[PDB]
Point group: D2
Chain length 129, copies 4
Amino acid sequence: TLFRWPVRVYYEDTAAGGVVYHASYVAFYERARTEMLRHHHFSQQALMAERVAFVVRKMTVEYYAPARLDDMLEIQTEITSMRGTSLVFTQRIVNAENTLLNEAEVLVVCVDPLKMKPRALPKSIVAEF
Amino acid sequence: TLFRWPVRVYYEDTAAGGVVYHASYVAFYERARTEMLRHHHFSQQALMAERVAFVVRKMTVEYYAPARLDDMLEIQTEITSMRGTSLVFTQRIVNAENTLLNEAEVLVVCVDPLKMKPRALPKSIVAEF
Amino acid sequence: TTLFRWPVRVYYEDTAAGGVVYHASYVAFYERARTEMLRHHHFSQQALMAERVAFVVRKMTVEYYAPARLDDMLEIQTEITSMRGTSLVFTQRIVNAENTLLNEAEVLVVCVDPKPRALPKSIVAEF
Amino acid sequence: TLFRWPVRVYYEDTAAGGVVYHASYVAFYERARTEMLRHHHFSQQALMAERVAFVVRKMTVEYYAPARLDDMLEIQTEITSMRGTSLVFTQRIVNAENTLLNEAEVLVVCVDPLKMKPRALPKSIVAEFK
Ligand SMILES: CCCCCC(=O)SCCNC(=O)CCNC(=O)[C@H](O)C(C)(C)COP(=O)(O)OP(=O)(O)OC[C@H]1O[C@@H](n2cnc3c(N)ncnc32)[C@H](O)[C@@H]1OP(=O)(O)O
């Protein structure tokens, strides 16, 4: 089920061309994943209490049009796949005119932050999604 | 042919998990492509002179193992495909023990800096690579 | 008075390997708050673009009293405490959810032509 | 006893105004302090494992002139005070033509990172910087 997250573009996100730096979008996507989990009570507390961390294993981003300084964006996020130890997030960013700026597909793996090796998906997360 | 670029990991690149933040690698890869171009005399000055800029159209990043604070990394970069308006860079990151940490494939489009619309690769770029 | 409040959530991108917010991240947080304060007083950046005005930091002093951490919801507090000629001073501080004072800053900002120009009369009148 | 460190300005460091973002200089200064420690044989990743870390307690930065894309900068760094738990770094940034761009003064405090509580500077670090 879709989760929406608003993001304002600030000077820090821009680059010399007047557009958002392409790596800043990657950070925006991470914020939206974090907020989606937070919304489902999967805070860092609840995660690291039942043995977890989440790390990015593979990420594909396709860039169509730029965001500019002071734009108000919407990050849209869905969990489209769940396996043994991993989830796939399907994400995209639109601007206030609903113009599609870029899209991402993010494979995420559940690990142990001390040693960082694949841990099975907690059943709480599987049932929640 | 392979272009090698060293990158040191600083606090600004790390996050609270104690490893490099996944978006930081995207910036590392960009620096290596910039320095690869610079090695062939395609500086920012030479590119502006021939009315050319490069933008990332699509990027896939594979995260195998973490970099940490104080690691001296080597980014390895090769141009593996050259189309009419487009270049594909294949890149990878190893640490000082030559452990493969990370790999990327980057589709880069040639645009004019005025309209940001695609344009044919400069003949010098085609001839050089 | 001019006191403006702005919330900021701490994300992974803001943290560093020590487990706390990287010290340069606070500098960005303070800039967002100045930007939003100006938006609240009807000086969005596209409006400022139309009046030929930009703002650049000339000098800043930051005091780091206690750290912010991943997932903290912070409040940036911002006041314009002086204005004269071409420049103005922002006084800013950051508190966490317990109202612990984490940080404070004094920022000298100069109005420029996107070179130093006098403050707009509307900006001075507003503050 | 100055320590010099070069830094190339990349597209990631620029902002919409065409110049380096004012917070990027702050990161440049941190890199130079880290490299000064590294030149004197100290690794902050290794020190972390010994429950030793350094945090910024106070910083002043003055911006005189901008850096731009592809500039090769030199960060210049000295330790000007050292006592108890703390060090003062005095730093500046010049460009390739030796134009003074930026200056900073940074009060740094040694802490146990587990508790984020100050501690005496390591004896070997004191020995190293006089
Ligand atoms: C390590 C990874 C990061 C790498 C480098 C970075 O980016 S560094 C990240 C940015 N820097 C920081 O986060 C440092 C934050 N500062 C601190 O944690 C602490 O100030 C610190 C141990 C240096 C110093 O603590 P001290 O109390 O011994 O020093 P000092 O007396 O000067 O502190 C001034 C005021 O701050 C208060 N104070 C100190 N620690 C506090 C805390 N944890 N929670 C609430 N208040 C605190 C003091 O009691 C005092 O309050 P009163 O004046 O009201 O009596």
